């Protein structure tokens, strides 16, 4: 139309980019404590 | 140097804290090689 949209999915890119936020925030989030934690393992069990 | 385990001696540690006493030595810490390594170090402590 566009609209783009129809709110829900303008405002669900409420939902859909921040989704895409919850999504890139979890591979922020578990990239982040998973490298510490692995380099904390490199330290755990090499070192 | 091995600590190892005690108890003894006199606080059944006495000492106990123990960051190293101070430090972390905490480079940045920021470096994470770990080269393998190695002795531990001979470095002419072996001969202290």
């Given at each position: 139309k566009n609209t783009t949209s129809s709110s829900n999915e303008n405002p669900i890119l409420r939902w859909m980019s921040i989704k895409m936020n919850g999504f890139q925030n979890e591979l922020n989030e578990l990239s982040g404590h998973m490298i510490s934690k692995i380099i904390h393992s490199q330290r755990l069990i090499l070192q | 140097s091995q600590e190892p385990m005690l108890d003894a001696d006199r606080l059944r540690?006495?000492?106990?804290?123990?960051e190293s006493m101070d430090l972390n030595y905490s480079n940045p810490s920021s470096s994470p090689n770990s080269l393998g390594n190695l002795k531990i170090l001979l470095d002419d402590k072996a001969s202290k």
């Open positions: - | 540690s006495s000492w106990t804290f123990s």
